[PDB]
Subunit: 122 residues, 4 copies
């Protein structure tokens, strides 16, 4: 498994900081601090990962969610990242994400941003 | 808040079953059973929701993750749903999702499915 | 082929109107009028479709683009729809879309909306 | 406008080749050759771009479609790229894409890949 490879502090191309602990069972728990958007300080995250990945050089599937409410701000929105962990000297988490805002029904067509983040250990 | 509105059993257009408990703090915990794909029985889910939504008729942002490993099967993949809860007589969770498979680096361009699920209480 | 099935006037769940002509070669040409957003009147569209689909009951893959500039307005943005045509008594075009705005580099993480539209002939 | 900046040969991170001509009106026409997937040689593309972008340093919105049928192969699928052109010494087209396959109704939940391509002139 990749419990030890995933656990730790990761940084994306925006300068955001993802701090995660991987459990033996498949759990991801930690904190996220965004460098951009309607965000300040750390937010709770939770998610899941494949604790028994293929042994054929494939990556390890995982995902997590942040709801953008903490003691400081409430951005009435949530992001989910879906992606894979790729181990080795330049380990990476390669993700795509969906950021949904709470909207009225009239604006719901415009509720959801999509993007991609790559996380490294440096 | 929508802790009471979200907590419970939901069903999507595929006939899948999402069983969730919403915590007062923003946590989502439960199980997912897919009617389709490389899946059997229930899988753990975790996620987050906005526990203090806007009071202007907007929906409530939330998201969750399933890693597709349980005691029966391992599909080496994870889905994340990002969406909003809309309360009332015909409550709904309207989502978009990202399903990432673990892949080799050569196949990583094709790692991620996108789609949309609408969940109802009936 | 589905040249005759695709050609014509389609309407989505938002009340927008998609008017398309399918060419024998795979071309899609027409106009789009959005019921929502920073849009008024008709905009040019172009796209492509599979002119020789599988004969196994599969749908017919297609896509198209609108840039949201016409004589009336310029929303500095473009949407692409990717989807499939499914023929028969209740024909449908089932799509997902990506709406990209021109942004500064600082805001580029938030450039792109994602959603889904279903088009019918009625 | 960016007619002159967009027109030409572009290459993505996969080694695919996008050859486009931008018209004064907003048209994109050209050919695409994928380095990956069920593809060989060149395929027709068409699309649109914002011919009068904001003058505030924002990028220029555009999109295009390929249906994956040519004289050599038919992959019964279409990709749409949605993105923005950013000019200057290291010009780039930054995109996200949706690749839809024709599917049966039973498999339609799994019809659509999502990803991201960055195109450069070198």
């Amino acid at each position: 498994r990749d419990e030890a490879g995933i656990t730790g502090t990761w940084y994306n191309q925006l300068g955001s900081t993802f701090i995660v602990t991987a459990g033996a069972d498949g759990a991801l728990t930690g904190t996220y601090e965004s460098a951009v958007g309607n965000a300040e300080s750390r937010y709770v995250l939770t998610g899941r990962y494949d604790s028994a990945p293929a042994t054929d050089g494939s990556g390890t599937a995982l995902g997590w969610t942040v709801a953008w409410k903490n003691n400081y701000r409430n951005a009435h929105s949530a992001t989910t990242w879906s992606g894979q962990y790729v181990g080795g000297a330049q380990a990476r988490i390669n993700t795509q994400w969906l950021l949904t805002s709470g909207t009225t029904e009239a604006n719901a067509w415009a509720s959801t941003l999509v993007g991609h983040d790559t996380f490294t250990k440096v």
